[PDB]
Structure 1
């Protein structure tokens, strides 16, 4: 349709050819409100409930140090990095922390298998300057 009066097909095509866009669709339909532990919010807050440790993928060896959090707004149970170094000894347990996320990757970034969240506060003045 390349005509001076065909503006209905050229508009009803880039309206039904635009749902096969993976990042546009995923940010239009309703999963960001049911299938997102965070929601719209960049940061959340929850109570640490279990100190954990997650193994690494397999070009790598070691044990990551992370937590388990029940958030206030939703009530879901998540997992989250305890950033850089020797910080699992700053969180204690049942403390209210601040979660931020990681950024992106394929989809999961920091603690290798299935962790997408990073602690930024311990109800203190952040797990950097503590």
Structure 2
């Protein structure tokens, strides 16, 4: 339909064909409010309950230290990295932490086995300056 009066089908075709966009459909359908532990929020707060260590993928070797967090807004249970060197010793238990994303990689990112969230505060200032 390349005609001069064929604007109904041209407009209607883009409506249907736009739903095949994986990156665009995901941001429109109702899943960011139900299937996202973080939600729309950039950062979230939760309580540390368990200190975990996840083995890396096959071409790597070592244990990725991380923590298990119970968020306040929802109540879900997640896993959060502990950035740079020796920062797990700074993290106590049953305390509030600020959890904030990662890049997004191929979804998962840098503690390898399915972790997608990194602890940026320990109540304190920073699991940087600390």
TM-score range normalised by the length of the shorter chain: over 0.9
User: What's 2:124 paired with?
Assistant: 124
Q: Distance in 1 between matches of 2:126 and 2:110?
A: 19
Q: Distance in 1 between matches of 2:71 and 2:96?
A: 9
User: What's 1:99 paired with?
Assistant: 99
Q: Distance in 2 between matches of 1:92 and 1:99?
A: 15
Q: Deviations over 1:52-79 (max 9, x none)?
A: 0000001000000000000000000000
Secondary structure of the structure 1 residue equivalent to 2:54? strand
Show structure 1 runs of 4+ deviating over 6 A: none
User: What's 2:6 paired with?
Assistant: 6
TM-score, normalised relative to structure 2: 0.99
Q: CA deviation at 1:92?
A: 1.1
Q: Name the structure with the higher helix share.
A: 2
User: What's 1:84 paired with?
Assistant: 84
Q: Deviations over 1:58-115 (max 9, x none)?
A: 1000000000000000000000100011011000111100000101111100100100
TM-score, normalised relative to structure 1: 0.99
Structure 2, unmatched stretches of 5+, are none
Q: Distance in 2 between matches of 1:3 and 1:18?
A: 22
Q: CA deviation at 1:122?
A: 0.3
Q: CA RMSD in A?
A: 0.4
Structure 1, unmatched stretches of 5+, are none
Q: Deviations over 1:9-31 (max 9, x none)?
A: 00000000000000000000000
Equivalent residue pairs, number: 130
Q: Distance in 2 between matches of 1:16 and 1:95?
A: 48
Q: Distance in 1 between matches of 2:76 and 2:36?
A: 10
